[PDB]
PDB file of C-alpha atoms and ligand atoms in Angstrom:
ATOM      1  CA  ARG A   1      -1.242 -31.737   0.861  1.00 51.49           C
ATOM      2  CA  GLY A   2       0.372 -28.147   1.102  1.00 49.83           C
ATOM      3  CA  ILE A   3      -1.145 -24.989  -0.367  1.00 48.43           C
ATOM      4  CA  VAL A   4      -0.026 -25.594  -3.957  1.00 46.63           C
ATOM      5  CA  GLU A   5      -0.968 -29.253  -4.090  1.00 45.76           C
ATOM      6  CA  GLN A   6      -4.336 -28.580  -2.369  1.00 45.99           C
ATOM      7  CA  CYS A   7      -5.133 -25.553  -4.589  1.00 45.82           C
ATOM      8  CA  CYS A   8      -2.767 -25.181  -7.592  1.00 41.21           C
ATOM      9  CA  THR A   9      -2.227 -28.941  -8.358  1.00 42.39           C
ATOM     10  CA  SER A  10      -5.934 -29.459  -7.190  1.00 43.86           C
ATOM     11  CA  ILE A  11      -9.062 -27.644  -6.505  1.00 41.62           C
ATOM     12  CA  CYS A  12      -9.927 -26.084  -3.127  1.00 41.55           C
ATOM     13  CA  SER A  13     -13.220 -24.264  -2.187  1.00 42.86           C
ATOM     14  CA  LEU A  14     -13.515 -21.269   0.151  1.00 43.23           C
ATOM     15  CA  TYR A  15     -13.006 -23.651   3.096  1.00 41.83           C
ATOM     16  CA  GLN A  16      -9.777 -25.113   1.753  1.00 38.15           C
ATOM     17  CA  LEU A  17      -8.144 -21.790   1.271  1.00 37.50           C
ATOM     18  CA  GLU A  18      -9.489 -20.410   4.620  1.00 40.04           C
ATOM     19  CA  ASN A  19      -6.913 -22.965   6.104  1.00 37.18           C
ATOM     20  CA  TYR A  20      -4.201 -20.564   5.371  1.00 38.82           C
ATOM     21  CA  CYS A  21      -5.728 -17.291   6.724  1.00 39.42           C
ATOM     22  CA  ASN A  22      -3.850 -15.896   9.864  1.00 36.78           C
TER      23      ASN A  22
ATOM     24  CA  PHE B   1     -16.992 -19.750  -6.449  1.00 36.47           C
ATOM     25  CA  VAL B   2     -13.830 -20.945  -8.195  1.00 38.36           C
ATOM     26  CA  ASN B   3     -14.071 -24.709  -8.889  1.00 38.52           C
ATOM     27  CA  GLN B   4     -10.755 -24.110 -10.453  1.00 33.19           C
ATOM     28  CA  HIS B   5      -6.891 -24.274 -10.063  1.00 32.66           C
ATOM     29  CA  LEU B   6      -5.231 -21.260  -8.605  1.00 32.11           C
ATOM     30  CA  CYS B   7      -1.457 -21.222  -9.166  1.00 34.64           C
ATOM     31  CA  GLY B   8       1.122 -18.738  -8.897  1.00 36.00           C
ATOM     32  CA  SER B   9       0.041 -15.146  -8.419  1.00 34.21           C
ATOM     33  CA  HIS B  10      -3.614 -16.120  -8.816  1.00 36.46           C
ATOM     34  CA  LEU B  11      -3.528 -18.154  -5.698  1.00 35.19           C
ATOM     35  CA  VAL B  12      -2.037 -15.264  -3.570  1.00 35.26           C
ATOM     36  CA  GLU B  13      -4.742 -13.030  -4.821  1.00 35.23           C
ATOM     37  CA  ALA B  14      -7.425 -15.650  -3.945  1.00 36.54           C
ATOM     38  CA  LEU B  15      -5.884 -15.775  -0.401  1.00 37.43           C
ATOM     39  CA  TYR B  16      -5.612 -11.838  -0.365  1.00 39.71           C
ATOM     40  CA  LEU B  17      -9.392 -11.542  -1.032  1.00 42.89           C
ATOM     41  CA  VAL B  18     -10.776 -14.557   0.894  1.00 39.18           C
ATOM     42  CA  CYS B  19      -8.789 -13.847   4.089  1.00 37.11           C
ATOM     43  CA  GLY B  20      -9.310 -10.034   4.278  1.00 40.44           C
ATOM     44  CA  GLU B  21      -8.083  -8.293   7.366  1.00 39.09           C
ATOM     45  CA  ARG B  22      -6.815 -11.476   8.885  1.00 37.64           C
ATOM     46  CA  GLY B  23      -4.003 -11.960   6.377  1.00 37.49           C
ATOM     47  CA  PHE B  24      -2.541 -15.232   5.120  1.00 38.35           C
ATOM     48  CA  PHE B  25       0.652 -17.366   4.816  1.00 37.43           C
ATOM     49  CA  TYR B  26       1.973 -18.498   1.331  1.00 34.22           C
ATOM     50  CA  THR B  27       4.597 -21.376   1.163  1.00 33.57           C
ATOM     51  CA  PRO B  28       5.212 -22.549  -2.324  1.00 36.28           C
ATOM     52  CA  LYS B  29       7.786 -25.139  -1.219  1.00 35.44           C
ATOM     53  CA  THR B  30       5.359 -28.159  -1.183  1.00 38.54           C
TER      54      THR B  30
ATOM     55  CA  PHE C   1     -10.510   1.527   2.981  1.00 39.91           C
ATOM     56  CA  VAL C   2      -9.766   1.274  -0.609  1.00 38.59           C
ATOM     57  CA  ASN C   3      -6.605   2.144  -2.613  1.00 39.41           C
ATOM     58  CA  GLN C   4      -5.054   0.682   0.576  1.00 36.57           C
ATOM     59  CA  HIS C   5      -6.862  -2.600  -0.119  1.00 38.36           C
ATOM     60  CA  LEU C   6      -5.926  -1.495  -3.632  1.00 38.83           C
ATOM     61  CA  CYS C   7      -2.295  -1.223  -2.726  1.00 38.48           C
ATOM     62  CA  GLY C   8      -2.078  -4.412  -0.661  1.00 40.60           C
ATOM     63  CA  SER C   9      -3.259  -6.585  -3.737  1.00 39.06           C
ATOM     64  CA  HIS C  10      -0.206  -5.092  -5.454  1.00 39.72           C
ATOM     65  CA  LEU C  11       2.059  -5.942  -2.397  1.00 38.39           C
ATOM     66  CA  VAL C  12       1.350  -9.709  -2.084  1.00 37.94           C
ATOM     67  CA  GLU C  13       1.720  -9.825  -5.873  1.00 38.19           C
ATOM     68  CA  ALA C  14       5.102  -8.162  -5.546  1.00 35.88           C
ATOM     69  CA  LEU C  15       6.010 -10.397  -2.533  1.00 31.46           C
ATOM     70  CA  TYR C  16       4.954 -13.433  -4.517  1.00 31.27           C
ATOM     71  CA  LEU C  17       7.420 -12.312  -7.239  1.00 28.00           C
ATOM     72  CA  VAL C  18      10.186 -11.138  -4.740  1.00 27.82           C
ATOM     73  CA  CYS C  19      10.033 -13.878  -2.079  1.00 28.43           C
ATOM     74  CA  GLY C  20       9.356 -17.028  -4.137  1.00 29.93           C
ATOM     75  CA  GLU C  21      10.605 -20.250  -2.595  1.00 29.37           C
ATOM     76  CA  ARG C  22      11.132 -18.595   0.711  1.00 28.20           C
ATOM     77  CA  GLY C  23       7.465 -17.764   0.720  1.00 29.93           C
ATOM     78  CA  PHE C  24       5.935 -14.854   2.902  1.00 31.15           C
ATOM     79  CA  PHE C  25       3.566 -14.020   5.638  1.00 29.48           C
ATOM     80  CA  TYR C  26       1.091 -11.007   5.214  1.00 28.38           C
ATOM     81  CA  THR C  27       0.296  -9.385   8.540  1.00 27.84           C
ATOM     82  CA  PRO C  28      -1.669  -6.101   8.373  1.00 30.08           C
ATOM     83  CA  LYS C  29      -1.185  -3.890  11.443  1.00 33.36           C
ATOM     84  CA  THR C  30       0.968  -5.918  13.769  1.00 32.89           C
TER      85      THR C  30
ATOM     86  CA  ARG D   1       8.400  -1.765  10.715  1.00 30.73           C
ATOM     87  CA  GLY D   2       4.884  -2.301   9.056  1.00 33.05           C
ATOM     88  CA  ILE D   3       4.138  -3.334   5.528  1.00 33.18           C
ATOM     89  CA  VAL D   4       1.260  -1.045   4.291  1.00 31.06           C
ATOM     90  CA  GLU D   5       2.893   1.781   6.213  1.00 36.53           C
ATOM     91  CA  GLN D   6       6.145   2.303   3.978  1.00 39.54           C
ATOM     92  CA  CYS D   7       5.072   0.501   0.760  1.00 39.86           C
ATOM     93  CA  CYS D   8       1.714   2.067   0.296  1.00 36.69           C
ATOM     94  CA  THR D   9       2.706   5.707   0.870  1.00 36.73           C
ATOM     95  CA  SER D  10       6.312   5.272  -0.088  1.00 39.54           C
ATOM     96  CA  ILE D  11       7.412   3.027  -2.987  1.00 39.45           C
ATOM     97  CA  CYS D  12       9.335  -0.166  -1.714  1.00 36.85           C
ATOM     98  CA  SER D  13      12.106  -1.305  -4.035  1.00 35.33           C
ATOM     99  CA  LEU D  14      12.826  -4.926  -4.773  1.00 35.82           C
ATOM    100  CA  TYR D  15      15.263  -4.827  -1.930  1.00 37.78           C
ATOM    101  CA  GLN D  16      12.902  -3.101   0.554  1.00 37.63           C
ATOM    102  CA  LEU D  17      10.248  -5.680  -0.358  1.00 36.29           C
ATOM    103  CA  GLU D  18      12.810  -8.571   0.411  1.00 34.59           C
ATOM    104  CA  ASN D  19      12.737  -7.530   4.045  1.00 35.78           C
ATOM    105  CA  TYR D  20       9.308  -9.262   4.149  1.00 37.31           C
ATOM    106  CA  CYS D  21      10.400 -12.623   2.769  1.00 37.99           C
ATOM    107  CA  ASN D  22      10.706 -15.832   4.947  1.00 39.81           C
TER     108      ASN D  22
ATOM    109  CA  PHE E   1      13.088 -15.118  -6.374  1.00 38.10           C
ATOM    110  CA  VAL E   2      11.019 -16.648  -9.044  1.00 36.85           C
ATOM    111  CA  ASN E   3      12.664 -19.933 -10.144  1.00 37.67           C
ATOM    112  CA  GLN E   4       9.747 -19.859 -12.473  1.00 36.39           C
ATOM    113  CA  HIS E   5       8.517 -19.245 -16.146  1.00 36.39           C
ATOM    114  CA  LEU E   6       6.945 -15.787 -16.516  1.00 35.58           C
ATOM    115  CA  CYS E   7       4.737 -15.489 -19.659  1.00 37.84           C
ATOM    116  CA  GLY E   8       2.175 -12.984 -20.992  1.00 36.41           C
ATOM    117  CA  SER E   9       1.162 -10.418 -18.447  1.00 38.90           C
ATOM    118  CA  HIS E  10       3.259 -11.958 -15.695  1.00 39.12           C
ATOM    119  CA  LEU E  11       6.560 -11.277 -17.421  1.00 38.31           C
ATOM    120  CA  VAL E  12       5.685  -7.529 -17.992  1.00 38.94           C
ATOM    121  CA  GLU E  13       4.759  -7.199 -14.321  1.00 36.64           C
ATOM    122  CA  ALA E  14       8.132  -8.833 -13.439  1.00 38.68           C
ATOM    123  CA  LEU E  15       9.948  -6.347 -15.674  1.00 37.65           C
ATOM    124  CA  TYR E  16       7.895  -3.524 -14.100  1.00 36.95           C
ATOM    125  CA  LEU E  17       8.804  -4.370 -10.633  1.00 36.67           C
ATOM    126  CA  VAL E  18      12.446  -5.400 -11.268  1.00 36.86           C
ATOM    127  CA  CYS E  19      13.418  -2.456 -13.492  1.00 39.87           C
ATOM    128  CA  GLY E  20      11.669   0.227 -11.364  1.00 44.12           C
ATOM    129  CA  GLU E  21      12.250   3.888 -12.296  1.00 42.48           C
ATOM    130  CA  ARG E  22      14.371   2.891 -15.271  1.00 40.73           C
ATOM    131  CA  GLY E  23      11.659   1.172 -17.381  1.00 41.60           C
ATOM    132  CA  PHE E  24      11.941  -1.741 -19.783  1.00 41.70           C
ATOM    133  CA  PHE E  25      11.234  -2.976 -23.307  1.00 38.51           C
ATOM    134  CA  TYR E  26       8.886  -5.878 -24.130  1.00 38.47           C
ATOM    135  CA  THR E  27       9.116  -7.626 -27.483  1.00 37.68           C
ATOM    136  CA  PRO E  28       7.056 -10.809 -27.641  1.00 35.29           C
ATOM    137  CA  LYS E  29       8.071 -11.545 -31.282  1.00 37.17           C
ATOM    138  CA  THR E  30      10.861 -13.923 -30.499  1.00 36.81           C
TER     139      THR E  30
ATOM    140  CA  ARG F   1      17.339 -16.141 -26.874  1.00 37.56           C
ATOM    141  CA  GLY F   2      14.756 -13.389 -26.716  1.00 37.88           C
ATOM    142  CA  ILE F   3      12.732 -12.206 -23.711  1.00 38.69           C
ATOM    143  CA  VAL F   4       9.965 -14.904 -23.924  1.00 39.35           C
ATOM    144  CA  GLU F   5      12.352 -17.673 -24.805  1.00 42.49           C
ATOM    145  CA  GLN F   6      14.778 -16.679 -22.082  1.00 41.85           C
ATOM    146  CA  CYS F   7      12.033 -16.148 -19.356  1.00 41.78           C
ATOM    147  CA  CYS F   8       8.644 -17.555 -20.577  1.00 41.29           C
ATOM    148  CA  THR F   9       9.950 -20.630 -22.470  1.00 35.47           C
ATOM    149  CA  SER F  10      12.747 -20.836 -19.793  1.00 34.71           C
ATOM    150  CA  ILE F  11      13.653 -19.559 -16.476  1.00 36.38           C
ATOM    151  CA  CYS F  12      15.509 -16.201 -15.898  1.00 36.88           C
ATOM    152  CA  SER F  13      16.774 -14.857 -12.508  1.00 38.24           C
ATOM    153  CA  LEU F  14      16.770 -11.281 -11.550  1.00 37.49           C
ATOM    154  CA  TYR F  15      20.043 -10.972 -13.815  1.00 36.61           C
ATOM    155  CA  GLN F  16      18.433 -12.267 -16.820  1.00 33.45           C
ATOM    156  CA  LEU F  17      15.430  -9.927 -16.632  1.00 34.02           C
ATOM    157  CA  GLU F  18      17.623  -7.023 -15.808  1.00 34.37           C
ATOM    158  CA  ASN F  19      18.911  -7.357 -19.328  1.00 35.49           C
ATOM    159  CA  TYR F  20      15.715  -5.641 -20.704  1.00 35.84           C
ATOM    160  CA  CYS F  21      15.602  -2.592 -18.399  1.00 36.77           C
ATOM    161  CA  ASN F  22      16.181   0.678 -20.064  1.00 35.69           C
TER     162      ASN F  22
ATOM    163  CA  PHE G   1       4.997   7.572  -5.065  1.00 34.79           C
ATOM    164  CA  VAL G   2       2.366   5.124  -4.923  1.00 34.63           C
ATOM    165  CA  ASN G   3      -0.889   4.872  -6.768  1.00 34.80           C
ATOM    166  CA  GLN G   4       1.242   6.182  -9.479  1.00 33.23           C
ATOM    167  CA  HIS G   5       3.328   3.186  -9.237  1.00 34.74           C
ATOM    168  CA  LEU G   6      -0.030   1.693  -8.602  1.00 34.65           C
ATOM    169  CA  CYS G   7      -1.228   3.088 -12.006  1.00 32.48           C
ATOM    170  CA  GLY G   8       1.748   2.193 -13.925  1.00 33.04           C
ATOM    171  CA  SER G   9       1.352  -1.552 -13.208  1.00 35.07           C
ATOM    172  CA  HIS G  10      -2.030  -1.222 -14.779  1.00 35.52           C
ATOM    173  CA  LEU G  11      -0.517   0.625 -17.868  1.00 38.62           C
ATOM    174  CA  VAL G  12       2.018  -1.989 -18.882  1.00 38.92           C
ATOM    175  CA  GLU G  13      -0.634  -4.570 -18.197  1.00 39.76           C
ATOM    176  CA  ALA G  14      -2.891  -2.596 -20.627  1.00 42.20           C
ATOM    177  CA  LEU G  15      -0.085  -2.048 -22.982  1.00 44.63           C
ATOM    178  CA  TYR G  16       0.714  -5.645 -23.204  1.00 43.41           C
ATOM    179  CA  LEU G  17      -2.946  -6.320 -23.984  1.00 47.83           C
ATOM    180  CA  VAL G  18      -3.261  -3.322 -26.500  1.00 49.10           C
ATOM    181  CA  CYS G  19       0.159  -3.664 -28.182  1.00 47.73           C
ATOM    182  CA  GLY G  20       0.741  -7.532 -28.394  1.00 46.64           C
ATOM    183  CA  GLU G  21       3.106  -8.462 -31.358  1.00 47.19           C
ATOM    184  CA  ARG G  22       4.253  -4.881 -32.006  1.00 41.75           C
ATOM    185  CA  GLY G  23       5.554  -4.803 -28.365  1.00 38.43           C
ATOM    186  CA  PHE G  24       6.255  -1.611 -26.387  1.00 37.20           C
ATOM    187  CA  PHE G  25       8.733   0.525 -24.665  1.00 34.88           C
ATOM    188  CA  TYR G  26       7.847   1.959 -21.170  1.00 36.25           C
ATOM    189  CA  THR G  27       9.738   5.243 -20.551  1.00 32.95           C
ATOM    190  CA  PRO G  28       8.749   7.160 -17.354  1.00 32.34           C
ATOM    191  CA  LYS G  29       9.366  10.812 -17.450  1.00 36.68           C
ATOM    192  CA  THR G  30      11.252  11.330 -20.920  1.00 36.27           C
TER     193      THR G  30
ATOM    194  CA  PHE H   1     -11.277   9.050 -13.800  1.00 34.29           C
ATOM    195  CA  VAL H   2      -8.414   6.852 -12.593  1.00 34.50           C
ATOM    196  CA  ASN H   3      -8.057   5.036  -9.475  1.00 36.26           C
ATOM    197  CA  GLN H   4     -11.670   4.490 -10.042  1.00 38.89           C
ATOM    198  CA  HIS H   5     -10.959   2.838 -13.464  1.00 42.31           C
ATOM    199  CA  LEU H   6      -7.991   1.440 -11.236  1.00 44.03           C
ATOM    200  CA  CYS H   7     -10.442   0.079  -8.549  1.00 40.94           C
ATOM    201  CA  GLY H   8     -12.811  -1.258 -11.197  1.00 41.11           C
ATOM    202  CA  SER H   9     -10.117  -3.652 -12.627  1.00 41.98           C
ATOM    203  CA  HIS H  10      -9.779  -4.949  -9.023  1.00 42.01           C
ATOM    204  CA  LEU H  11     -13.584  -5.497  -8.911  1.00 41.74           C
ATOM    205  CA  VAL H  12     -14.179  -7.618 -12.005  1.00 42.04           C
ATOM    206  CA  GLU H  13     -11.057  -9.521 -10.896  1.00 40.09           C
ATOM    207  CA  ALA H  14     -12.551 -10.161  -7.476  1.00 40.60           C
ATOM    208  CA  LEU H  15     -16.018 -10.767  -9.158  1.00 42.85           C
ATOM    209  CA  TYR H  16     -14.429 -13.305 -11.443  1.00 40.20           C
ATOM    210  CA  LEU H  17     -13.044 -15.037  -8.297  1.00 38.65           C
ATOM    211  CA  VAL H  18     -16.167 -14.548  -6.048  1.00 37.91           C
ATOM    212  CA  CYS H  19     -18.792 -15.552  -8.707  1.00 37.66           C
ATOM    213  CA  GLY H  20     -17.217 -18.350 -10.851  1.00 39.58           C
ATOM    214  CA  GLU H  21     -19.867 -20.623 -12.490  1.00 39.15           C
ATOM    215  CA  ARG H  22     -22.692 -18.178 -11.914  1.00 36.93           C
ATOM    216  CA  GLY H  23     -20.820 -15.501 -13.797  1.00 34.98           C
ATOM    217  CA  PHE H  24     -21.537 -11.805 -13.432  1.00 30.73           C
ATOM    218  CA  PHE H  25     -22.590  -8.633 -15.242  1.00 30.74           C
ATOM    219  CA  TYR H  26     -20.594  -5.463 -14.781  1.00 29.45           C
ATOM    220  CA  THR H  27     -22.792  -2.306 -15.090  1.00 28.29           C
ATOM    221  CA  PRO H  28     -21.156   0.979 -14.229  1.00 29.34           C
ATOM    222  CA  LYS H  29     -23.708   3.793 -13.188  1.00 29.36           C
ATOM    223  CA  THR H  30     -27.132   2.143 -13.681  1.00 26.00           C
TER     224      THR H  30
ATOM    225  CA  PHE I   1      -3.381  -6.830 -30.425  1.00 26.26           C
ATOM    226  CA  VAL I   2      -3.539 -10.146 -28.589  1.00 25.19           C
ATOM    227  CA  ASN I   3      -3.318 -12.980 -30.991  1.00 23.16           C
ATOM    228  CA  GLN I   4      -3.467 -14.988 -27.978  1.00 22.33           C
ATOM    229  CA  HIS I   5      -5.731 -17.130 -25.666  1.00 24.45           C
ATOM    230  CA  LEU I   6      -7.295 -15.140 -22.760  1.00 22.85           C
ATOM    231  CA  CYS I   7      -8.388 -17.440 -19.974  1.00 22.50           C
ATOM    232  CA  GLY I   8      -9.648 -16.990 -16.458  1.00 17.20           C
ATOM    233  CA  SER I   9      -8.823 -13.602 -14.923  1.00 17.20           C
ATOM    234  CA  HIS I  10      -7.031 -12.429 -18.059  1.00 14.03           C
ATOM    235  CA  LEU I  11     -10.181 -12.661 -20.162  1.00 15.58           C
ATOM    236  CA  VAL I  12     -12.246 -10.486 -17.744  1.00 15.14           C
ATOM    237  CA  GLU I  13      -9.516  -7.856 -17.702  1.00 15.12           C
ATOM    238  CA  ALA I  14      -9.353  -7.926 -21.589  1.00 15.51           C
ATOM    239  CA  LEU I  15     -13.134  -7.338 -21.650  1.00 14.57           C
ATOM    240  CA  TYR I  16     -12.788  -4.571 -18.891  1.00 17.34           C
ATOM    241  CA  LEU I  17     -10.267  -2.596 -20.891  1.00 14.03           C
ATOM    242  CA  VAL I  18     -11.879  -3.252 -24.424  1.00 17.02           C
ATOM    243  CA  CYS I  19     -15.459  -2.508 -23.393  1.00 18.99           C
ATOM    244  CA  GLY I  20     -14.623   0.604 -21.259  1.00 19.94           C
ATOM    245  CA  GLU I  21     -17.563   2.692 -19.987  1.00 20.10           C
ATOM    246  CA  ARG I  22     -20.062   0.272 -21.512  1.00 22.07           C
ATOM    247  CA  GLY I  23     -19.338  -2.825 -19.348  1.00 19.24           C
ATOM    248  CA  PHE I  24     -19.645  -6.431 -20.096  1.00 22.80           C
ATOM    249  CA  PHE I  25     -20.957  -9.907 -19.361  1.00 21.35           C
ATOM    250  CA  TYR I  26     -18.805 -12.987 -18.304  1.00 19.83           C
ATOM    251  CA  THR I  27     -20.284 -16.328 -18.380  1.00 23.08           C
ATOM    252  CA  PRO I  28     -17.763 -19.060 -17.922  1.00 21.15           C
ATOM    253  CA  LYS I  29     -20.500 -21.868 -18.169  1.00 23.08           C
ATOM    254  CA  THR I  30     -19.820 -22.686 -21.861  1.00 23.28           C
TER     255      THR I  30
ATOM    256  CA  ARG J   1     -19.121 -20.759 -29.297  1.00 25.70           C
ATOM    257  CA  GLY J   2     -19.364 -19.062 -25.850  1.00 28.40           C
ATOM    258  CA  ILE J   3     -16.941 -16.561 -24.387  1.00 32.83           C
ATOM    259  CA  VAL J   4     -14.275 -19.172 -23.164  1.00 35.09           C
ATOM    260  CA  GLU J   5     -14.512 -21.276 -26.250  1.00 31.77           C
ATOM    261  CA  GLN J   6     -14.309 -18.245 -28.538  1.00 33.88           C
ATOM    262  CA  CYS J   7     -11.449 -16.512 -26.530  1.00 34.80           C
ATOM    263  CA  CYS J   8     -10.050 -18.930 -23.977  1.00 33.69           C
ATOM    264  CA  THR J   9     -10.123 -22.240 -25.879  1.00 36.14           C
ATOM    265  CA  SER J  10      -9.604 -20.255 -29.099  1.00 35.90           C
ATOM    266  CA  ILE J  11      -8.311 -16.730 -30.226  1.00 36.33           C
ATOM    267  CA  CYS J  12     -10.524 -13.696 -30.533  1.00 36.45           C
ATOM    268  CA  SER J  13      -9.635 -10.191 -32.019  1.00 39.36           C
ATOM    269  CA  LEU J  14     -10.965  -6.899 -30.742  1.00 34.92           C
ATOM    270  CA  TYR J  15     -14.060  -7.591 -32.696  1.00 37.57           C
ATOM    271  CA  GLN J  16     -14.775 -11.090 -31.114  1.00 37.01           C
ATOM    272  CA  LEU J  17     -14.597  -9.666 -27.616  1.00 34.72           C
ATOM    273  CA  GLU J  18     -16.700  -6.629 -28.440  1.00 33.04           C
ATOM    274  CA  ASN J  19     -19.553  -8.997 -28.776  1.00 32.82           C
ATOM    275  CA  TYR J  20     -19.693  -9.316 -24.963  1.00 34.57           C
ATOM    276  CA  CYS J  21     -19.742  -5.622 -24.126  1.00 34.63           C
ATOM    277  CA  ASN J  22     -23.107  -4.202 -22.774  1.00 31.46           C
TER     278      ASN J  22
ATOM    279  CA  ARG K   1     -27.327  -0.245  -5.074  1.00 31.94           C
ATOM    280  CA  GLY K   2     -24.251   0.554  -7.297  1.00 34.41           C
ATOM    281  CA  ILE K   3     -21.067  -1.236  -7.652  1.00 36.51           C
ATOM    282  CA  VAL K   4     -18.177   1.424  -7.874  1.00 39.63           C
ATOM    283  CA  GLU K   5     -20.147   3.253  -5.068  1.00 40.99           C
ATOM    284  CA  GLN K   6     -19.752   0.918  -2.145  1.00 40.62           C
ATOM    285  CA  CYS K   7     -16.769  -1.170  -3.223  1.00 37.55           C
ATOM    286  CA  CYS K   8     -14.412   1.645  -4.354  1.00 34.02           C
ATOM    287  CA  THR K   9     -14.806   3.931  -1.358  1.00 36.31           C
ATOM    288  CA  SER K  10     -15.798   1.215   1.102  1.00 33.02           C
ATOM    289  CA  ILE K  11     -14.165  -2.288   1.109  1.00 33.08           C
ATOM    290  CA  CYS K  12     -16.656  -4.998  -0.114  1.00 36.57           C
ATOM    291  CA  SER K  13     -16.188  -8.273   1.630  1.00 37.81           C
ATOM    292  CA  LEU K  14     -16.480 -11.697  -0.216  1.00 41.04           C
ATOM    293  CA  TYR K  15     -20.316 -11.600   1.006  1.00 40.60           C
ATOM    294  CA  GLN K  16     -20.790  -7.983  -0.200  1.00 39.10           C
ATOM    295  CA  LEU K  17     -19.272  -8.962  -3.554  1.00 41.44           C
ATOM    296  CA  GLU K  18     -21.348 -11.975  -3.815  1.00 40.05           C
ATOM    297  CA  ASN K  19     -24.554  -9.623  -4.171  1.00 39.55           C
ATOM    298  CA  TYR K  20     -23.333  -9.038  -7.723  1.00 36.17           C
ATOM    299  CA  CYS K  21     -23.106 -12.598  -8.908  1.00 33.33           C
ATOM    300  CA  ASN K  22     -25.609 -14.213 -11.372  1.00 36.16           C
TER     301      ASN K  22
ATOM    302  CA  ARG L   1       3.346  13.345 -24.771  1.00 37.47           C
ATOM    303  CA  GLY L   2       4.135  11.450 -21.601  1.00 38.79           C
ATOM    304  CA  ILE L   3       2.559   8.129 -20.478  1.00 36.75           C
ATOM    305  CA  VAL L   4       1.874   8.515 -16.692  1.00 38.01           C
ATOM    306  CA  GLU L   5       0.694  12.008 -17.270  1.00 36.63           C
ATOM    307  CA  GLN L   6      -2.529  11.549 -19.502  1.00 35.68           C
ATOM    308  CA  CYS L   7      -3.256   7.902 -18.565  1.00 34.66           C
ATOM    309  CA  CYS L   8      -2.851   8.151 -14.728  1.00 34.49           C
ATOM    310  CA  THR L   9      -5.009  11.308 -14.137  1.00 34.48           C
ATOM    311  CA  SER L  10      -7.148  10.891 -17.371  1.00 34.53           C
ATOM    312  CA  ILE L  11      -8.396   7.526 -18.643  1.00 33.50           C
ATOM    313  CA  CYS L  12      -6.750   6.370 -21.819  1.00 34.47           C
ATOM    314  CA  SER L  13      -8.852   4.442 -24.191  1.00 34.37           C
ATOM    315  CA  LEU L  14      -7.620   1.528 -26.060  1.00 34.75           C
ATOM    316  CA  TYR L  15      -7.024   3.980 -28.948  1.00 37.98           C
ATOM    317  CA  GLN L  16      -5.211   6.425 -26.739  1.00 34.54           C
ATOM    318  CA  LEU L  17      -3.079   3.435 -25.286  1.00 29.90           C
ATOM    319  CA  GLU L  18      -2.260   2.454 -28.786  1.00 30.32           C
ATOM    320  CA  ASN L  19      -0.190   5.656 -29.360  1.00 28.26           C
ATOM    321  CA  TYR L  20       2.455   3.734 -27.198  1.00 31.81           C
ATOM    322  CA  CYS L  21       2.871   0.690 -29.206  1.00 30.55           C
ATOM    323  CA  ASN L  22       5.846  -0.005 -31.486  1.00 28.45           C
TER     324      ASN L  22
HETATM  325 ZN1  LIG M   1      -1.888 -15.799 -15.249  1.00 29.49          ZN
HETATM  326 ZN1  LIG M   2      -4.388  -1.603  -8.756  1.00 30.49          ZN
END
């Protein structure tokens, strides 16, 4: 739900942060 | 790994490590 | 290899601070 | 002009850094 | 820029970047 | 109201942190 | 120029940790 | 002496991120 | 010093500085 | 009570973190 | 194989780093 | 005696650092 809502307001694994790599 | 919230500058450091040579995009808008 | 990966971690940390709402892309080489 | 080039041999000011914001 | 709270070590890093060659004073007393 | 109350307990722009540069 | 600006960011980060309540000034050259 | 103490701070920061729950030991030399 | 909570990556940086050449062990389990 | 409960959930001095050095 | 050796002259990937986790 | 001088070529201990506290 956006980088901060997926990772900062929530918890993301390696394969929920890998979504924002170039 | 990090079963943990990563906010502010800790999120962009996580991206920096994880992505590596590729690079990343940070948009703190929403 | 390193102390350029070392410097890059300071960049996206500075860019998070400098850019904020606007956000930023980080594109090595290019 | 590249990032690592003129901020990792030279020191980029807050105004030089801002060239890299969206 | 950073329409955001900067506490602890993130405040002194903000000062460090913003101030540059000048330098700064940190007093976390009050 | 002090550096932490102006910036940590509050929000300061570039020109509310520039107050503490030498 | 850099990796001395790189080292300085580690200093005020160490000084924040080391000094705490007392606080600290950061005066390059001088 | 330094920029290897500089690199080591980036390691345990990366290792905290990489290792998480498992945790880690940091043993220089050895 | 730091009459303050040190969590996440700020705890491992505190350990890193404080311990020095010795090294440390981080276990965030409990 | 563990490193995080002694230092993160609590407050530890130099001689409550020195307990975890090698 | 040592830490500072092949992560502070070479760049260790997230997978090379993971060799050092418990 | 300067900061960047003997903490950025030499490694300053927590006790050498403390010379720079108020
Ligand atoms: Zn933080
Ligand atoms: Zn560094």
